[PDB]
Amino acid sequence: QFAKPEDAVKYRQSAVTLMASHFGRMTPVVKGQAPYDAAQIKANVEVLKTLSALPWAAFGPGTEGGDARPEIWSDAASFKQKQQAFQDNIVKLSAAADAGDLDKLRAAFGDVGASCKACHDAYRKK
Amino acid sequence: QFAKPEDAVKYRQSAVTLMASHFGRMTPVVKGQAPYDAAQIKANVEVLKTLSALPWAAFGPGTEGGDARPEIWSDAASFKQKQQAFQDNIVKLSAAADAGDLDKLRAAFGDVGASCKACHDAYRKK
Ligand code: HEC
Ligand code: HEC
């Protein structure tokens, strides 16, 4: 869907920006600093689920640029693995949110955050 | 969810960037320059539906900046009207996509694009 590779860069940066906001805005809730409203979180995690699927299609072939390391393309199977692990952890977070269980939500949230960091440590230019 | 108003600006710009891509990527399909796959479009319009709800909450009070005109806040009822008309037209586009009907899709797509433009003409700094 991108006329030029820069367009893919701008898309994926916007997608991870929105993902980061929908993930990170729950930090005060997981920590107990903000109240836990099960329906609020269920709805937010549904948004995060949609968003978390979107960046990966904007790392198509020839879309090198931004802060993506070139390893994303030369090691396509390792990157796909990191994306799928991340989205599988999103599935666990959805299940926690849908169950309305703050303890499960906390655990799942920390697993998702670790899978964000693991991808960045390997595939994001510092 | 925004620590500073700039964060709201960066969110809403990313949200409308993603919305614009999910809308505009269908242009070749509506024009017949690319094939029409009903399931492909249904799924894309589901993504667009989610995204089209997201910018508006990032124009909260005190979040003046970017290319938003100040009129968004002083005329809150007129802006809300423009957002709701836009999202109602998104509902019509979802119904067309869910029906698998290219003629209805075409019509609905042009209504959505007109409601993008109408908001920009009043509320987006040139
Ligand atoms: C790989 C499988 C990733 C996962 C999982 C997550 N992110 Fe990431 N992110 C990744 C890359 C390769 C990049 C660089 C993109 C580019 O072309 O520049 C990023 C970038 C970010 C950013 C910065 C965006 C900006 O516009 O500056 C943020 C804020 C970010 N990523 C956040 C983030 C979060 C919170 C994640 C899990 C919920 C997450 N990312 C996962 C690769 C990958
Ligand atoms: C008001 C009810 C709007 C509707 C409907 C749409 N958009 Fe818009 N858009 C609006 C504003 C106020 C702004 C400025 C935001 C800011 O703070 O800077 C925008 C901006 C855009 C942009 C530019 C984003 C950038 O990062 O440069 C694009 C590409 C854009 N909008 C696209 C777009 C499309 C395609 C729409 C319908 C599908 C649409 N917008 C509707 C306000 C409103």
Numbering used by the authors:
A (entry chain A), B (entry chain A): 1 to 126
How did the manuscript describe this experimental structure?
All of the tertiary structures are similar to wt AXCP and only salient points concerning the heme region are discussed here. Ferrous structures show the different residues at position 16 to lie over the heme in a similar manner to that of Leu16 in wt AXCP with the exception of L16A where the side chain is essentially truncated.
